[PDB]
Design a protein around this ligand. Structure first.
Ligand SMILES: [Au+]
Length: 172
């Protein structure tokens, strides 16, 4: 299917830091792409958690230099929460796409078939995640914004300051 384009407007410590534009692989992983797209628009409203099914206002809570930036936990904000629009967890749709380099967009999980709303953007090639995380898009603009967020990560995963998805949505 035609490929959706979505964006995040990022703040770092409250400071406007630019836009990350992403292309989703609707044609390869439609269920996975459709979940992320709707979480960018917020169109499915309040989820089972009672919080909005929406990345807006959420943070990259886990950021590791030379690895990736991870976000999508809008229910607990710490890596233990998050919710897909389908309502809890859904199976890995396929592993056709691989972690080929910086910019790759892929699902975070807790093992096989545990996709929620958490995701990461790779800042390096992470071949060791192939077949274990579902890859469903890539950055096409704003890789420099991804690097700026990455600069605030630590080996420990804890960010130096709040890296927020201040706005987000779908481009037509
Ligand atoms: Au993994």
């Amino acid at each position: 299917m035609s490929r959706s384009k979505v964006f995040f407007d990022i703040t770092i410590g409250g400071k406007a830091s630019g836009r990350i534009v992403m292309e989703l692989y609707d044609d390869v992983v439609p269920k996975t792409a459709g979940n992320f797209r709707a979480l960018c628009t917020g169109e499915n409203g309040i989820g089972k958690s009672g919080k909005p099914l929406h990345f807006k206002g959420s943070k990259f809570h886990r950021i590791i230099p030379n690895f990736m930036i991870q976000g999508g936990d809008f229910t607990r904000g710490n890596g233990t929460g998050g919710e897909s629009i389908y309502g809890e967890k859904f199976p890995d749709e396929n592993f056709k796409e691989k972690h080929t380099g910086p910019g790759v967009l892929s699902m975070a999980n807790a093992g096989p078939n545990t996709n929620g709303s958490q995701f990461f953007l790779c800042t390096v090639k992470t071949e060791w995640l192939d077949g274990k995380h579902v890859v469903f898009g890539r950055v096409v603009e704003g890789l420099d914004v991804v690097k700026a967020v990455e600069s605030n990560g630590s080996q420990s995963g804890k960010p130096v300051k709040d890296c927020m998805i201040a706005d987000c949505g779908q481009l037509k």
